[PDB]
Design a protein around this nucleic acid. Structure first.
Ligand SMILES: [Mg+2]
Ligand SMILES: [Mg+2]
Ligand SMILES: [Mg+2]
Ligand SMILES: [Mg+2]
Ligand SMILES: [Mg+2]
Ligand SMILES: [Mg+2]
Ligand SMILES: [Mg+2]
Ligand SMILES: [Mg+2]
Ligand SMILES: [Mg+2]
Ligand SMILES: [Mg+2]
Ligand SMILES: [Mg+2]
Ligand SMILES: [Mg+2]
Ligand SMILES: [Mg+2]
Ligand SMILES: [Mg+2]
Ligand SMILES: [Mg+2]
Ligand SMILES: [Mg+2]
Ligand SMILES: [Mg+2]
Ligand SMILES: [Mg+2]
Ligand SMILES: [Mg+2]
Ligand SMILES: [Zn+2]
Lengths: 98, 24, 125, 155, 127, 206, 60, 80
RNA sequence: CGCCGUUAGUUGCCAGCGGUUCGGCCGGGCACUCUAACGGGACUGCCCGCGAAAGCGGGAGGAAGGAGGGGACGACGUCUGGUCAGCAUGGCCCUUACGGCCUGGGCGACACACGUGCUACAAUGCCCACUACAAAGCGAUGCCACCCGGCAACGGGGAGCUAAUCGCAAAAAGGUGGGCCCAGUUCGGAUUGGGGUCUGCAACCCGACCCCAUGAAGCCGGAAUCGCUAGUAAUCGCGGAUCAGCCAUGCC
């Protein structure tokens, strides 16, 4: 176990989270279980377009939360000092629970 | 009909549970 | 037969039949049959004289039924009209009592519509 | 239909008689989009056709259908005055549908406690030229033409 | 030994596996005729077979999930015609003109605001 | 009553977000509030700098803030002065160790917000609305830009019956997502009520 | 609303059943999306300004 | 249909005021605004002035009235 | 959204082998389904016919063919259209009240009238039992498996989930069996009596749910009048926002 689930609001920016987090123990290091998609959760808000009456206009927003899996199988500690101390994207989060 | 609360389907409409529609 | 005081169901299933009695319906039929021991399915015609009895001596001497109900219920309401009680006024008046709306839709408690006029100029909408 | 002309939808043929004049009848028997109910009604009705006559149901069915479709109907029209019931032809695709419809409606007029029995007896009676449904057909055609006087709007 | 097609209809996805055999179909660990029990369609999911001569020349085991049995029926109807092309690919000559290889892309229409039911608009009063 | 927000419309493309972080449901609420609190301060004590957008990135307690100004003098102060007071003015309210990078706006008259304000500033001073606008556009056209448009609402010229003044040159392809069309709005509090000033600036396709 | 009435801020409300959201922004008491703390309009306005992260307009 | 299980609510502004008057004499008119308090045996005999939102009211309190609340006897709105 | 591909295997399965408490349950695979990223595909490109050209008609191949299906997107302007009560904001007005705090009442009144809806008037049906097949969502001051108490609402215990992994969750029409017999009924569930549960300081005015009794009008609706062109109408259930609770049959 080396739980590493990645979740933010942008999917371009969840490549700058799976690529370098694999390109470290990819062909030089260990193995890695590959970045696995994992279904996303969207939240819709349906605000009425105007203030005051006009019951029937509305406009839909959403807040998509995209995910990935990774999980670095066979963990040498050399990659770790390289993996745990190299980052890049701002609006991303990490979870780590072996 | 969906009106009678002492029916199965009257309780499915209400989204509730009781003697007339047990929760498994 | 004559299951409950001055009452007489016939020729349909027994459980449906006993519904024709005042303080009784399905719920009290399924019970007073299971407890009395008669198959709910048989037509009333096919009941042993012995069976009708075991039923009648139970149903009557175990529940407030017929007149004994619908006269005490009427007195159970006079009590509210006796004191000051809101529901009492609401019973006197002849309007809902379970805190419903009265601007539209009290038709069942009031009875048929007693229509009246409008004003002078106004929308006849 | 201001723009184009609209094509008749080609309905998928039957599962038991392979006929499209049947799913046609089966759709009209259907309500609230419960198609399984409809089939179970009709195919049952076919089983009652087979009982009360040695004839294949499919030739009995088609027989009543042909027997119901009108050759004339009326269609209101005006220039002034009032709505003049104008007699006119009944273009084949409509004979098809008027027949199917009336058949089902007529079927559900019957006193027969359940459907299928209703459908059977109505499907049967109509083959024999009797039974209301043919009422509509005849009382349509008879009521049309009886306005021959206004038939000078041929189209 | 094996032959395979997918097949889809209203997000309903069948998995079709053709095998040489006797005509005994099996959908989701069950007899074809006791999973589509009572549905007068069903027998319609095999129409690619009884129209290229197959049925009892072949056997079929099937994974199915998503939707309701009529979509599940049509998604099979497809999945078989596909596996049947993975066989003799000449099965198209008299198979495509009948439909079968098409994928009914008809899907449930989005519910839209200001209407009750996407298209059913709310009724009104005084025009 | 028409027309959506040319920024909000294009948000997925051409134009990105102003705040830039991630947060669970138990967080987003008061977190985002803070972001706005910082934007609110960053205009009261930062008006004359001429500020376009206040970016706000975030990691766990590394709240970025990246004030875009045209005149990064007034932001930084005399020596490094003003930007010391403000970095610790963002610390009084946000207890979450902030930065305050400042990226100058190369050509202020190519960023709609700024343009929009210059026009609003002119009018608050009593001025030639109908002229000011045509001026404001020409500036955005002499500064490049494949097109531009500016709108002042009503009570023009301190009038009586609210109007709407126009002026627009080049292309302003409001319906296309492959756009890139800055949009800024300035209020114009006058002696006799407010006047809305919208500015649009089209600058290139893909 | 009335600046006085802005006192859900009033920490102790005697009993929670008097506690009631308002829009942190405009003070509205009547369409306050829990997630945001914003009301109907403030929500839409800020969304379009692009000031609340990861929120696009939804199309499906 | 009733409703209160256990803890048969009776507001306490007058719960002791009613039994502090059961140490001597039944004082005439002991007004409240708690039209929400259930009547309880120690209340029998007295006379409570219940508010309307407008007026207090002479509610002579008998024996039949017990399960009820005072508000049931102090009618609010007024009719044709 | 519809077909196909590459990337990715704590979701996937007689694809294919081993064990079985026969539960993908385990070893184990990534083929398939799926999840979510990046691509390919479609353009009157090919064919026959009319046309000066655009284009029109049919045919082929294809998952799809002429805008393949549904969104988002609202021109210069118009109604001196709506909103000073979301928010700003000019002017006007009140300043021991036109401001402020409370407790209580009212916004829920009822001779009447209309709008939008819900449940019906039933056999293509209602009831009960058993047995299938979804999508989209939500969830630790939470969702609540599971075991007891209770006719039940629910109460007391208590596992797993910070969620493709646990729970809400039962989908319901459907299918199989059984009942009902044309009846104001085993249709319909209004009304009222009674006893309870729950949330909240507090349910009289004025909450929802449970159980028992009651079992009203309603046999398809005058003149008028609304919606819908295809996965549409029709019908069947499922979820979410608001929110302690809830008057939701509303909305999305
Ligand atoms: Mg619109
Ligand atoms: Mg019933
Ligand atoms: Mg639907
Ligand atoms: Mg104010
Ligand atoms: Mg509240
Ligand atoms: Mg084995
Ligand atoms: Mg795929
Ligand atoms: Mg050409
Ligand atoms: Mg367009
Ligand atoms: Mg007005
Ligand atoms: Mg008050
Ligand atoms: Mg109101
Ligand atoms: Mg009206
Ligand atoms: Mg139990
Ligand atoms: Mg039966
Ligand atoms: Mg009708
Ligand atoms: Mg149309
Ligand atoms: Mg709720
Ligand atoms: Mg609801
Ligand atoms: Zn607000």
């Amino acid at each position: 176990k080396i739980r590493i689930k990645l979740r933010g609001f942008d999917h371009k920016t969840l490549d700058a989270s799976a690529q370098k987090i694999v390109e470290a123990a990819r062909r030089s290091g260990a193995q890695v279980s590959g970045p696995i998609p994992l279904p996303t959760r969207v939240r819709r808000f349906t605000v009425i377009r105007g203030p005051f009456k006009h019951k029937d206009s509305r406009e839909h927003f959403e807040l998509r939360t995209h995910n990935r899996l990774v999980d670095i199988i066979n963990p040498n500690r050399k990659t770790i000092e390289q993996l745990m101390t190299l980052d890049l994207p701002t609006g991303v989060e990490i979870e780590i629970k072996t | 009909g969906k009106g009678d609360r002492r029916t199965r389907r009257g309780k499915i409409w209400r989204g509730t549970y009781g003697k007339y529609r047990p929760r498994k | 037969a004559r299951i409950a005081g001055v009452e007489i169901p016939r020729n349909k299933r027994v459980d449906v039949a006993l519904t024709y009695i005042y303080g009784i319906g399905k719920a009290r039929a399924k019970e007073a049959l299971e407890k009395t021991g008669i198959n709910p399915a048989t037509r009333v015609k096919d009941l042993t004289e012995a069976e009708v009895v075991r039923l009648r001596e139970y149903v009557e001497n175990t529940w407030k039924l017929e007149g004994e109900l619908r006269a005490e219920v009427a007195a159970n309401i006079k009590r509210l009209m006796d004191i000051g009680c809101y529901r009492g006024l609401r019973h006197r008046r002849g309007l809902p009592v379970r805190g419903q709306r009265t601007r539209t839709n009290a038709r069942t408690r009031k009875g048929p519509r007693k229509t009246v006029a409008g004003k002078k100029k106004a929308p006849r909408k | 239909a201001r723009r184009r002309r609209a094509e008749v939808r080609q309905l998928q043929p039957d599962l038991v008689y392979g006929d499209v004049l049947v799913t046609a009848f089966i759709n009209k028997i259907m309500r609230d989009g419960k198609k399984n109910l409809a089939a179970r009604i009709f195919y049952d009705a076919c089983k009652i056709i087979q009982e009360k006559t040695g004839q294949e149901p499919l030739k009995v069915f088609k027989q009543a259908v042909e027997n119901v479709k009108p050759r004339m109907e009326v269609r209101s029209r005006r220039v002034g005055g009032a709505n003049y019931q104008v007699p006119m032809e009944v273009s084949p695709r409509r004979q098809q549908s008027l027949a199917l419809r009336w058949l089902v409606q007529a079927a559900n007029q019957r006193p027969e406690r359940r459907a299928a029995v209703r459908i059977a007896h109505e499907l049967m009676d109509a083959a024999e030229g009797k039974g209301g449904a043919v009422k509509k057909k005849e009382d349509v055609e008879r009521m049309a033409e009886a306005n021959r006087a206004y038939a000078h709007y041929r189209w | 030994e094996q032959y395979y097609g997918t097949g889809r209809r209203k997000e309903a996805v069948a998995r079709v596996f053709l095998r040489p055999g006797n005509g005994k179909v099996t959908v989701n660990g069950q007899d074809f005729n006791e999973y589509f029990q009572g549905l007068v369609r069903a027998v319609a999911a095999l129409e690619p077979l009884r129209a290229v001569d197959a049925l009892g020349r072949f056997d079929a085991y099937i994974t199915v999930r998503g939707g309701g049995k009529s979509g599940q029926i049509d998604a099979i109807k497809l999945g078989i015609a596909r596996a049947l092309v993975q066989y003799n690919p000449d099965y198209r000559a008299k198979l495509k003109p009948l439909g079968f290889l098409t994928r009914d892309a008809r899907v449930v229409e989005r519910k839209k605001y200001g209407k009750h039911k996407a298209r059913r608009a709310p009724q009104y009063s005084k025009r | 009553g028409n027309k959506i927000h040319p920024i909000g419309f294009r948000l997925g493309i051409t134009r990105d977000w102003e705040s830039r972080w991630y947060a669970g449901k138990k967080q987003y609420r008061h977190l985002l509030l803070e972001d706005q609190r910082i934007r609110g301060l960053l205009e009261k004590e930062l008006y004359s700098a001429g500020l376009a957008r206040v970016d706000i990135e975030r990691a766990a307690d590394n709240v970025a803030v990246t004030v875009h100004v045209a005149k990064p003098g007034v932001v930084i102060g005399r020596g490094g002065e003003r930007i010391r007071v403000l970095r610790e003015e963002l610390a009084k309210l946000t207890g979450k160790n902030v930065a305050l990078n400042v990226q100058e706006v190369q050509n202020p008259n190519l960023s709609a917000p700024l343009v929009a304000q210059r026009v609003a500033e002119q009018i608050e001073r009593r001025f030639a609305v109908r002229r000011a606008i045509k001026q404001a556009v020409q500036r955005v056209m002499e500064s490049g830009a494949k097109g531009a448009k500016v709108i002042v609402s009503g009570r023009i010229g301190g009038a009586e019956q609210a109007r709407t003044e126009w002026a627009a040159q080049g292309r302003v392809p409001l319906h296309t997502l492959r756009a890139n069309i800055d949009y800024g709005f300035a209020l114009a509090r006058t002696t006799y009520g407010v006047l809305g000033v919208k500015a649009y600036i089209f600058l290139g396709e893909v | 609303a009335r600046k006085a009435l802005i006192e859900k801020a009033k920490r102790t409300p005697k009993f929670k059943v008097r506690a009631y959201t308002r829009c942190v922004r405009c003070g509205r008491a009547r369409s306050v999306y829990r997630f945001f703390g914003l009301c109907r309009i403030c929500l839409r306005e800020l969304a379009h300004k692009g000031q609340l992260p990861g929120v696009r307009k939804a199309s499906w | 249909p009733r409703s209160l299980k256990k803890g048969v609510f009776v507001d306490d502004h007058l719960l002791e005021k009613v039994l502090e008057l059961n140490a001597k004499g039944e004082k005439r008119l002991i007004k409240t605004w708690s039209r929400r308090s259930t009547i309880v045996p120690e209340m029998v005999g007295h006379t409570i002035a219940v508010y309307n939102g407008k007026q207090h009211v002479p509610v002579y309190i008998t024996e039949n009235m017990v399960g009820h609340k005072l508000g049931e006897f102090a009618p609010t709105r007024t009719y044709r």
